[PDB]
């Protein structure tokens, strides 16, 4: 029942990931049992309801807008922005923050791999206008016509801050949490899809 992209089938592929020294591997070679064209469509294609489901799977995300399609479209250099509110129960700072997300397609080749960069800004938190989280999501062909996912994350600073090492550590942990919700939702969508007909 899911969106398709050709080729529907391919041998396992391998992107080369220029992991920098301030980069952290968030998750590596996480299998998603569906073809690469289908997982790219689920996350990034014209029917944005599946990405919205990824966001609402985490019950701390509230006030979630409709996700726009990519501008100008799902092509290299396309991008999109969307926003939601993240509930926090932090000792410090507010009880919720706007989450400002930006995705840009860096590389797209269903015969090889797809790289999307997603940038998250959380301005309402302490030191929050000074940094952004940048995750590179690589999608590539796995074994038996499935998709493997690898995520690399860094924190980009635009001014100096008091909590750099701490916020980098917390942001890395928060992105592993966010990638786990995206993996669970994707595997749930595919598994419910295979249950139909």
3-state secondary structure the chain: CCCCCCCCCCCCCCCCCCCCCCCEEEEEEEEECCCHHHHHHHHHCCCCHHHHHHHHHCCCEECCCCCCCCECCCCCCCEEEEEEEEECCCCCCCCEEEEEEEEEEEEECCCCEEEEEEEEECCCCCCHHHEEEEEEEEEEECHHHCEEEEEEEEEEECCCCCCHHHHHHHHHHHHHHHHHHHHHHHHHHHHHHHCCC
Q: Nearest Cα to 140, choosing from 50, 51, 11? A: 11
Place of tokens 């609402």: 56
Resolution in A: 2.2
Residue 107 contacts residue 76 (beta carbons within 8 Å): yes
Method: X-ray
The number of distinct structural domains making up the chain is 1
User: What is the rounded CA–CA span in Å between residue 50 and residue 46?
Assistant: 10
For 197, the domain range is 1-197
Measuring CA to CA, which residue among 96, 71, 97, 66 is closest to residue 82? 66
């Amino acid at each position: 029942t899911l969106p398709k992209m050709e080729p529907s089938s391919h041998a396992p592929t391998e992107p080369d990931i220029q992991k920098d020294k301030d980069d952290s591997i968030i998750r590596e070679n996480e299998n998603i049992p569906a073809p690469l064209g289908t997982v790219v469509q689920l996350l990034f294609g014209s029917n944005t309801e599946y990405m919205q489901k990824v966001i609402t799977r985490d019950k701390n995300n509230v006030n979630v807008e409709t996700i726009p399609k990519f501008t100008p479209s799902l092509v290299e250099g396309g991008s999109r922005h969307y926003e939601y509110t993240k509930k926090l129960n932090n000792s410090i700072g507010p009880k919720q923050t706007k989450c400002l997300l930006t995705e840009s397609i860096e590389h797209m080749d269903i015969n090889n791999y797809v790289l999307v960069t997603q940038t998250t800004k959380t301005p309402d938190v302490p030191s929050g206008s000074n940094f952004a989280v940048e995750s590179k999501i690589f999608l590539f062909w796995g074994q038996h016509d499935t998709t493997n996912m690898t995520v690399i994350t860094k924190i980009n600073w635009t001014s100096k801050s008091f909590l750099k090492g701490a916020i980098e550590k917390g942001s890395v942990e928060g992105q592993k949490v966010s990638v786990d919700y995206m993996l669970s939702e994707l595997r749930d969508i595919i598994s419910r899809a295979k249950s139909k007909k």
